[PDB]
Design a protein around this ligand. Sequence first.
Ligand SMILES: *[C@@H]1O[C@H](CO)[C@@H](O)[C@H](O)[C@H]1NC(C)=O
Lengths: 49, 45
Amino acid sequence: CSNLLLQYGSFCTQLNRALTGIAVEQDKNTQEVFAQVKQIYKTPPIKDF
Amino acid sequence: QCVNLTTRTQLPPAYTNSFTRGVYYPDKVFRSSVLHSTQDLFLPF
Ligand SMILES: *[C@@H]1O[C@H](CO)[C@@H](O)[C@H](O)[C@H]1NC(C)=O
């Protein structure tokens, strides 16, 4: 079956390319939402707000 | 006729690294500027 699938080849190369693009896009989405800033601020010990 | 040979000297069998060797044409078709993939009996690199 692998030998027979060999002569298709380009089809699941295309599929893997598409899925990798999707995964990279997911990481991009999370970064662009949450990594708006880069200075990791932290709260002061005193909560005198 | 045939004669058995006597003068000999045995040694441990010699071994070597075959790297990027043992590749032959798969068919008889003129393919140029194409990266083609195939599966056959091949000498592993
Ligand atoms: C020696 O030669 C004979 C016949 O010529 C053959 O039968 C025999 O197998 C040979 N032996 C060896 C060790 O070559």
